[PDB]
Amino acid sequence: IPLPGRQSPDHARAEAEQLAWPRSLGLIRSDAAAERHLRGGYADLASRFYPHATGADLDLGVDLMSWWFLFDDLFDGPRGENPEDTKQLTDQVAAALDGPLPDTAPPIAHGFADIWRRTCEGMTPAWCARSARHWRNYFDGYVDEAESRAAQYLAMRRHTIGVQPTVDLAERAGRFEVPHRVFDSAVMSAMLQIAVDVNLLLNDIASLEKNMVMHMQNEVRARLEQYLLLESCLPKVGEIYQLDTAEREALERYRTDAVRTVIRGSYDWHR
């Protein structure tokens, strides 16, 4: 992975204060759960996904990582092999995308609603709708993966790896938006799928002590070499979509602070 390792200069404060939010929303209710959370290194991970963020913007990134691993842990028991119970909980979470939640919603849903509320404030409505669809794609794929209990395994895990909502938050944490017509471009779509696949392959390698392996390094290498080719096309892609000066700068920030960070950030976090 020929991408520079980066970490937010405010990582120390964000890691020290990471527990206040999930405790405030009832996601962490015991000192043992707090210590188990601290052992995950989730603020550290967020500080590498979002090195361009500090302060409240970085805190939103930490909270997303915090929420996501707290969320995923709720499905590692009997409710994981139960597709109806999986969809039952994810529907209550994803309902936050459509409007206010009822007070009876479980804490994990109120946690997501607080993240989604913060994620959208200040962004264009079209960015919000597109980011909302990315969340629905994840939750739908999360249910589909529960219903299932190389080519077929990849098509399923590309939704549940959760790269796209992670990349989306880098835009919000950076207070920029890649031009929407470039996001939909075949070149950017190919760059994003590489980011999805590399995170997927690197995850199953690190999660082997417990799957794709059941050649992977060559696939990560070939995809990263193609990622650089696709990056070199971006100047011409910017011309094809007639980007002005600010749009070219937002596209550059997306390339360096959102796409590259989600590729390199997970690699450095695992190590």
From Swiss-Prot:
Optimum pH is 8.2-8.4. It catalyses: (2E,6E)-farnesyl diphosphate = pentalenene + diphosphate. Monomer. A motif (DDXXD motif) lies at residues 72-76. Mg(2+) 1 binds at residues 72, 76. Disulfide bonds join 120-128. It is an enzyme of class 4 (lyase). GO terms for molecular function: metal ion binding; pentalenene synthase activity. Its cofactor is Mg(2+). Belongs to the terpene synthase family. Binds 3 Mg(2+) ions per subunit. One of its GO terms (biological process) is antibiotic biosynthetic process. It comes from the Bacteria. This is Pentalenene synthase. Keywords: Antibiotic biosynthesis, Disulfide bond, Lyase, Magnesium, Metal-binding. Its EC number is 4.2.3.7. SUPFAM superfamilies: Terpenoid synthases. Catalyzes the cyclization of farnesyl diphosphate (FPP) to the tricyclic sesquiterpene pentalenene, which is the hydrocarbon precursor of the pentalenolactone family of antibiotics produced by a variety of Streptomyces species. Mg(2+) 3 binds at residues 203, 207. Changing residue 269 to F: 4-fold decrease in activity. 2-fold decrease in catalytic efficiency. The gene is penA. Mg(2+) 2 binds at residues 72, 76. Changing residue 270 to S: 3-fold decrease in activity. Pathway: Sesquiterpene biosynthesis; pentalenene biosynthesis; pentalenene from farnesyl diphosphate: step 1/1; Antibiotic biosynthesis; pentalenolactone biosynthesis. Changing residue 203 to A: Loss of activity.
